[PDB]
Design a protein around this motif. Structure first.
Motif, PDB file in Angstrom:
ATOM      1  N   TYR A  28      15.318  84.341  42.683  1.00 26.01           N
ATOM      2  CA  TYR A  28      16.510  84.441  43.031  1.00 26.01           C
ATOM      3  C   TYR A  28      17.085  83.037  43.444  1.00 26.01           C
ATOM      4  N   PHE A  29      17.603  82.098  42.496  1.00 22.32           N
ATOM      5  CA  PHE A  29      17.872  80.887  42.601  1.00 22.32           C
ATOM      6  C   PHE A  29      19.566  80.741  42.213  1.00 22.32           C
ATOM      7  N   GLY A  30      20.127  80.023  43.094  1.00 25.43           N
ATOM      8  CA  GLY A  30      21.707  79.883  43.058  1.00 25.43           C
ATOM      9  C   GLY A  30      22.452  81.297  42.816  1.00 25.43           C
ATOM     10  N   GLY A  31      21.874  82.399  43.394  1.00 23.64           N
ATOM     11  CA  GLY A  31      22.432  83.530  43.325  1.00 23.64           C
ATOM     12  C   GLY A  31      22.226  84.445  42.033  1.00 23.64           C
TER      13      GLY A  31
ATOM     14  N   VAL B 105      22.045  75.203  39.603  1.00 27.18           N
ATOM     15  CA  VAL B 105      22.521  76.005  40.408  1.00 27.18           C
ATOM     16  C   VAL B 105      23.640  77.158  39.532  1.00 27.18           C
ATOM     17  N   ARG B 106      24.484  76.231  38.988  1.00 21.81           N
ATOM     18  CA  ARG B 106      25.027  76.996  37.576  1.00 21.81           C
ATOM     19  C   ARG B 106      24.372  77.276  36.574  1.00 21.81           C
TER      20      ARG B 106
END
Lengths: 375, 373, 374
Positions: free
Chosen positions: C28-31, C285-286
């Motif tokens: 789980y990276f960047g939400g 992140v995006r």
């Protein structure tokens, strides 16, 4: 007239207060464990704050002889001052008195002058010292916090009579309880040795305890008693109230703040004027459970608003309405949307709120009460 | 006036801090779980960084006898130095002095070496060692992290008196808290035997726990206190402030980085100078939920901007305007999409941010403060 | 100093890494959910690779007794070797030793000689084995991946001494994270019994999991620490750096590759050198979304380039300039297409990329480093 300050403030993970074992202080409110900040800690934080620096003057020390020596200058007489205090009713242990003495710092000069003379004897000097100490209650912090002083009767001169030494406290502070189930967390730390050596281990292994909670703080200031304690100095009382509000809003306990910089400002301040003290702590008998569609601070403020509305509609519906001011930073968190009329005004600035409180009290500008300075 | 640094930093899946059980450190902020980095971890990462190397004076060791032993003479460590340290109040156990002693590295060390080596008689070298240890106080890291030391009174002889050892810390560091809900993930790993000298086994099987989070960092350096702790050396204090500002951005915790490389520099730094410390941690009392039209970092910075604007217009608007500088890498993330000029300056480089901070400190340029030490 | 390697790899639908439950690894990276390949899997894929076989001077094992017996010859030393190891600090309460000794060096003949030496006592022989475990001081994989073992205290009487065993590894590998939203899918398979029956025929019902993702990987080699771990021998360190670059460029985890062959090669490798480690994972992140007039790989590389430009212009120091080499197969995806050249030079083929890395790191060449056979 009573000045009631109700504060909802959330803190970062920190240990602001701890007992002998180092754990954060806790209380059992409503049958559930809460996080507690003692009233003494908040009182000391407000007292030893930049906004309350001008209204200092009360010193609570067991080392009065040191202060007398510092004020008198280079004339020794420290032992004779200590013996005068001893005859007055303050026994020493090794070098300081066995009990704390609360007194205005302006009368240290009077004490030094009374000690320094050689015409006065010993009973007369002790009586004069007692008279000066018992009459030093002009400091605003002494007016807010109060004082009790019981000298050692057994180890006292027979011909020394004490006047009244107690001053009524014009400030009531409740312990800061949390609005939710306060769960504590254990921090496992290690101390590292810079020198490699041969062990290749650690300098120290320990356990640190911290907790984060949304705190509800309640303050109560008696305007008439604050005025009486200062002997009719209404301007000084207004300055004290304003600086107390600014301090309570703008300073936090200095406990483990070098490692836990919990410098969070309050998210909502409610200032209410009434003749009887009312605490909204029962708003949080139900611990606040955080929901996904809202926020913990928002939920706490909503519960507080509901309880405030209930209290206003069920206890304070008379010919005398209760006027209250609600402050949030830039109106970030208002009161309950279901009413939108609980507070008389919704101020978005702390300085504006202080000005409004001062104006409503008796009519007072902040500039003309800050203008009372000695230089 | 206080130098406070607010940082928004997103980290790759990693374990920067863990407890004795190996789980990444966590905390409950806003009623929800958050990933956490301890303040001492960041403090030691800054202290043991390359940008802070030039100002690293201080040991904090329990092996002071070994440090004094480094002389040519080898008959003063096991007996002499140990006895003098014991008489100073530092109990001995297994060629170490039990508790740590924070002290200046070079000068007070060779003063204690000279004191220990002959002359001045006996029963008095403990007095000299205690006097030199309790009075050093001259170190940027001691000036920042503080010092606090009470020797044990049972072992120390009654003829040795200790001066004031404590110093007041000029640095306040808050624990790094995630701006969103923590999502601790478990990594399943095995260790494989290279040679198949037996049946078709595997080897060791274990449990690895990691997480990824966007962190909000808080720092606070008291300028007057830092200058006071350094005996009034303004240039040394400015060098310390600049090096700390550089390190807080350019170094990361040194935990499981061989397997979880998380060398991500912050994507937003907010440095504002004020007379009172305020922490913008309540900007994330509501955990950040990512939407499809944005990312986590931009949303966190937007919430931080909203909270900062609320603080500025709700706590003081006249008098002191609170000068604040906002830094993003090449202005990648502006502080909110609202009307600009919320911060005094928008800087796209860390070196210019350090220069502006030092200029507001009193006009010491970053070039000539490096010669202070 | 530090050698940083950033690669962008697009992988065909496969299951390169999986957990105990069979699902492909995720993070789980960047939400948002991402596909993950663990760092240890990449490290073993590099270590157990054809290109990285001239420096495979390391063996991690628990059956060190078997290796000693094999080195000794027909002489039976298995029981004596296990007794020596047990008194060395490697307990054995059953038919299995619970410790991974990573000496891994070529000095196993020394241990065999100690065991078969019928002139020294067992305690001093155990001491000689123990103090020869530590001084391996060879093998590139020791330098890239260190040691930590410290035997046990329930055995190994105090009459036996030990030296330092930590190596302080000089290689940092990050977990490969997808540059987009993970899309885990389910495969329906059956046993499909051979011999026909009266019914339709169904051997067994099961579910298989797989995913396809574009992976961004991060590598970091400390040159000075790598040289220190090898006690000099800059030629061996250069050979190790070149072999690591080649392996990371052409190697993949062997997880489920028989049925899910995904031997894809990187679309672009960024090799850049500085004094402090830099990770470009925040570029993603995006997550990268599909655009009709583009593809996932080129969009991912564009986002990486934007983040790299922002980092370079946001953390620039004059006294320590940061330069780097960009490689993509025959310049398939140009880095600086519009107006500028972010990288120092664009390299079309991998061999000249490794040559540039070598002759910048120490002036070495890829040709004469192979002569360091031993």
């Amino acid at each position: 007239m009573l000045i009631e300050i109700h504060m909802i403030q959330n803190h970062s993970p920190a240990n602001l207060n701890r007992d002998d074992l180092g754990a954060p202080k806790t209380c059992y409110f409503g049958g559930v464990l809460r996080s507690r900040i003692s009233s003494q800690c908040i009182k000391r934080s407000i007292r030893t704050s930049n906004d309350f620096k001008a209204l200092l003057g009360g010193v609570r020390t067991r080392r009065l002889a040191d202060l007398i020596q510092q004020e008198a200058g280079e004339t020794e007489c420290w032992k004779k001052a200590q013996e005068i205090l001893n005859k007055c009713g303050f026994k020493n242990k090794d070098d300081n008195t066995k009990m704390l003495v609360f007194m205005s710092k302006d009368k240290i000069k009077d004490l030094a002058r009374i000690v320094l003379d050689n015409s006065l004897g010993l009973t007369e000097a002790a009586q004069q010292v007692a008279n000066v100490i018992a009459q030093a209650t002009l400091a605003p912090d002494i007016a807010l916090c109060g004082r009790m002083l019981e000298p050692n009767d057994k180890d006292k001169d027979k011909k020394v009579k004490w006047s009244n030494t107690t001053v009524e406290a014009a400030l009531q502070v409740a312990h800061a309880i949390s609005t939710h189930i306060a769960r504590p967390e254990i921090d496992y730390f290690v101390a590292a040795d810079d020198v490699p050596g041969e062990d290749a281990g650690a300098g120290h292994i320990g356990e640190s305890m911290f907790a984060s909670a949304c705190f509800y703080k309640y303050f109560s200031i008696d305007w008439e008693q604050l005025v009486k304690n200062l002997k009719g100095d209404t301007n000084l009382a207004a300055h004290t109230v304003g600086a107390f509000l600014l301090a309570a809003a703008k300073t936090n306990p200095s406990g483990k703040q070098n490692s836990f910089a919990a410098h969070n400002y309050p998210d909502g301040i409610l200032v209410e004027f009434k003749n009887s003290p009312i605490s909204y702590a029962n708003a949080f008998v139900r611990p606040v459970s955080v929901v996904k569609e809202s926020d913990l601070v928002e939920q706490s403020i909503g519960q507080l608003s509901n309880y405030v509305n209930d209290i206003r509609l069920g206890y304070y519906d008379e010919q005398s309405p209760v006027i209250g001011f609600w402050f949030s930073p830039n109106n970030r968190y208002p009161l309950g949307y279901k009413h939108s009329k609980l507070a008389s005004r919704n101020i978005g600035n702390l300085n504006e709120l202080v000005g409004a409180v001062l104006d409503y009290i008796g009519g007072f500008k902040w500039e003309e009460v800050q203008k009372s300075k000695a230089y």
